């Protein structure tokens with residue numbers, strides 16, 4: 001039993017809700033919140049900008065030190081940093097950004113990072129301003145992630161479309 005509330009169950013291990021991931025993180029305080037990161041951990045907009053704003057820019061400060069030490073992430077890769085006031089940990093995961101021409105096959109590699117964590121609160125990778133089809137992202141999530149994932153979808157219209165089209 002965990003504290004995630006109001007989710008629709010899609011599969012044995014994948015759950016989905018129309019929710020603001022920032023508000024959901026603040027209420028649940030999950031062990032792991034996933035950020036829709038880029039390779040530079042520059043959290044300017046979309047989910048990343050929202051999460052970073054909620055940390056009063058502490059996520060960005062920590063991220064800049066991480067990059068200065070380690071260099072950029074790989075597309076499809078991840079790193080674990082602090083969850084600040086939102087979660088114990090933040091798993092920064094880089095899905096391919098279609099508006100940069102990155103290979104969408106890398107989306108499966110991106111979701112594989114979730115398997116290193118037993119339970120996660122997450123957005124749909126590569127959705128939103130990353131330009132991929134969210135229906136496709138949900139399919140890859142279901143077919144790749146084996147650990148317990150609670151997906152937060154900000155847009156109600158998109159949430160309803162994802163549920164209604166789910167196979």
Ligand SMILES: O=C(N[C@@H]1c2cccc(O)c2C[C@@H]1C(=O)O)c1ccc(Nc2cccnc2)cc1
Pocket residue numbers: 020021022045046047050051053123124127128129134152153154155158
């Ligand atoms: O980018 C965001 N979502 C994407 C989006 C947006 C629109 C249509 C879409 O299909 C998608 C897919 C993505 C998703 O749903 O994950 C997002 C989520 C929460 C948020 N929280 C917040 C907002 C304002 C101030 N502070 C915190 C901000 C942005």
